[PDB]
C-alpha cells in the first residue's frame with residue numbers, strides 16, 4: 001500500500017527526476033511529517049532502480065548517507081511514476097548553502113570531515129563490523145547534490161550514475177558508459193580518456209578528485225581564511241555555465257588548472273591543513289591522491 005503523501009513543493013529538477021518536499025500524513029489527527037519524494041518517469045526506470053538498489057542496501061546505512069524510507073510505483077493517467085521517499089533536509093544542497101552563507105572554521109571541519117566519512121563508507125570493501133561489502137563509487141559528486149543536515153554535516157544522495165564495483169563488470173560495459181557525470185568535476189584522467197578499464201578500483205580516485213573540488217568550495221566560503229569572496233563554483237571564472245568536456249580538458253588537463261588558493265588563506269593553521277590535503281586529492285596523478293578514509297582521518301586531527 002502507497003504511503004499517504006501530499007506533494008508540496010518542487011525543490012529539485014534533474015536529468016532523471018524531480019525532487020519534492022512532501023507531507024506524509026500517516027495520521028489525520030496528528031501533525032504531518034516532512035519527507036522528500038524523488039519522482040522518476042517510466043522512461044528513467046533505470047536511474048530509479050540504480051538509486052533504489054543503493055538506498056535499500058543494509059550495508060549502505062550511514063549518518064552521511066541520505067536516509068531512505070521506501071520505493072513505490074505509482075500509476076498515473078499518462079503512464080507510471082517511480083518514487084524514492086527519503087528524509088528531507090530543509091537546509092538544501094551544499095552549493096546553495098555556500099552561496100548564501102559564510103561558514104565558521106567549526107562548520108568547515110564538520111562539513112569536510114563528514115563528506116570524507118560518507119565517501120569513505122561508499123568506497124569501503126568492509127562494513128564497520130568487518131564483513132566484506134561491495135564498494136560503491138558515486139561518479140557524480142558535486143556541491144549541488146550534497147545535502148546539508150540540520151547539524152551542519154554533509155549527507156550524500158543522487159546515486160543515479162553510481163557504480164557498484166562488481167568483479168563481474170566488463171570493459172565493454174564500462175567504456176560504453178564512458179565519461180559519465182558533470183564535466184566541471186571530472187578528474188583529468190577521465191577528461192583525458194586515460195583510465196585502465198579493467199581496473200575498476202581506480203574509479204575511487206576519480207571520486208576523490210571531485211571531493212577535493214567540493215572541499216575547496218567549502219574552504220572558499222570559510223571566514224577563518226580572512227576576507228571571503230562571493231561564492232563561485234570550481235572554474236567559474238574560466239568556463240561557461242554548462243561547460244563541455246573539451247573545454248574542461250583544456251583547463252584541468254592541458255593547463256593543469258585548479259581553483260586558486262590565495263597564500264593568505266594559509267595563515268590559519270587549520271585552513272592550511274585542509275588546503276594541503278585537498279591539493280593532494282586533486283593531483284594530476286590519481287596515485288598521488290589520498291584515499292577518502294585518509295582525508296577523514298586528517299579531519300579528525302583538526303580538533304587541535
Ligand SMILES: COc1cc(-c2cnn3cc(OC)c([C@H]4COC(C)(C)C4)nc23)ccn1
Nearest residue numbers: 011012019036038088089090092093157158
Ligand atoms: C538530488 O537527490 C535527492 C534529494 C533529496 C532531498 C532531501 N532533502 N532535500 C532537500 C532539498 O532542498 C531543500 C533538496 C533540493 C536541494 O538541492 C537539490 C537540487 C539537490 C534538491 N533535495 C532534498 C532526496 C532524494 N534525492
